[PDB]
Ligand binder design. Structure first.
Ligand SMILES: Nc1ncnc2c1ncn2[C@@H]1O[C@H](COP(=O)(O)OP(=O)(O)O)[C@@H](O)[C@H]1O
Ligand SMILES: Nc1ncnc2c1ncn2[C@@H]1O[C@H](COP(=O)(O)OP(=O)(O)O)[C@@H](O)[C@H]1O
Ligand SMILES: [Mg+2]
Ligand SMILES: [Mg+2]
Ligand SMILES: [Mg+2]
Ligand SMILES: [Mg+2]
Lengths: 202, 205
């Protein structure tokens, strides 16, 4: 496994490069080198946007997945359309739990009540340049109750629910029709775990 | 089942503004877009972290069923991880005019000392598209893991990298346990866990 711990790095300072809705910070630090020495002072620009809870809504009776569609303007330059098919997800505020955020977002974004839950995994989105961590849960849902247009319109959140079979959702990953990290990770996990999960929940 | 509802015809990007430029940039996108229930939104603004795009290489030895991992410090992991040194895939920024495959092969040499034989695409994904434009394109690359050792990276760029070789099964168990928890490695190793049997047959023929 890994070689060094937090005993082996010192963050000297952090400087706010930009403060707005999100922040960009310059971390200044030194760290041990694999050759046995210490680095000089290194600086890295880090996008600070908090952390997220992600919910894979899975109906184990029907073997169906609920997806939410909404515009993500950052996708525009590299994608055929900025409207993406994604997992229910939202930002975790101070003092909130991953699971409470997932439930609230499932109601706001898909009109869905959630039953049992299990962790999938918690990942760093792109740790060379952002601190963001996203914690994914699978949540038991009745996909027949998932339909229509949701999102908080007063916060400019316009979301369309789509229900697909599990195998259909995974085919959409393999074809590139679903191509955001949270959904790819959740759906590849589901393809590796669905047999045991369906047995546990039925 | 149809799929997505709207296209680039259905959004108007009114303006982009660079709010910060250094090594990376933070841009403000200003736009309006079609709504599912009919009309057009008002003007919306979003802050978008712009850092270009990346090529990622999963180094897989199909003879030995082994993967090569690279270890380096990622200081952004500090606040939410036990250690900021992460076990990762070979990966590099794509510059103008260079292909995913060109970058993946070059970085495999610079970061791990690895010659790569055949390659195949895995997936191309958006890292976190609510706040960053970054797209990463993953290939799997054929390597001899018995050649993989030592300390690499470009010292002139303060890039200090240690090579590790483990079985595919160990790498995947480390994903399950949270010891590998960066998106590119999670996606690549979950793909490998779903596809390794056919891949080994293809590459040892
Ligand atoms: N990139 C951004 N720039 C500015 N505001 C944002 C950005 N991303 C999200 N917001 C604000 O936060 C709200 C919720 O964000 P949303 O993207 O729906 O949650 P998540 O990204 O966790 O799924 C948005 O309606 C918007 O007001
Ligand atoms: N967040 C950052 N802030 C400042 N410089 C960076 C940052 N991330 C990477 N760099 C610089 O750019 C180089 C890019 O190396 P490369 O292997 O192409 O990218 P990655 O860090 O994504 O694997 C790093 O070795 C470092 O010198
Ligand atoms: Mg959301
Ligand atoms: Mg929301
Ligand atoms: Mg790299
Ligand atoms: Mg490199």
């Amino acid at each position: 496994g890994i070689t060094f711990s937090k005993n082996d790095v010192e963050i000297i300072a952090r400087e706010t490069l930009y403060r707005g809705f999100f922040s960009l910070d310059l971390y200044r630090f030194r760290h041990r080198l694999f050759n046995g020495g210490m680095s000089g002072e290194i600086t890295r620009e880090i996008f600070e946007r908090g952390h997220a809870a992600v919910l894979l809504p899975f109906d184990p009776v029907r073997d169906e997945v609920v997806l939410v569609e909404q515009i993500r303007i950052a996708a525009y330059d590299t994608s055929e359309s900025p409207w993406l098919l994604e997992m229910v997800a939202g930002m975790i505020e101070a003092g909130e739990t991953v699971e409470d955020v997932a439930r609230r977002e499932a109601l706001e974004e898909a009109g869905l009540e959630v039953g049992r839950t299990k962790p999938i995994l918690s990942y760093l989105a792109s740790p060379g340049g952002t601190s963001e961590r996203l914690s994914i849960l699978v949540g038991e849902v009745d996909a027949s109750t998932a339909k229509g247009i949701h999102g908080l319109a007063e916060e400019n959140e316009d979301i369309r629910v789509h229900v697909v079979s599990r195998e259909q959702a995974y085919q959409w990953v393999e074809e590139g029709k679903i191509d955001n990290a949270a959904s790819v990770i959740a759906l590849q996990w589901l393809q590796l775990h669905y047999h045991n999960l369906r047995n546990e929940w039925t």
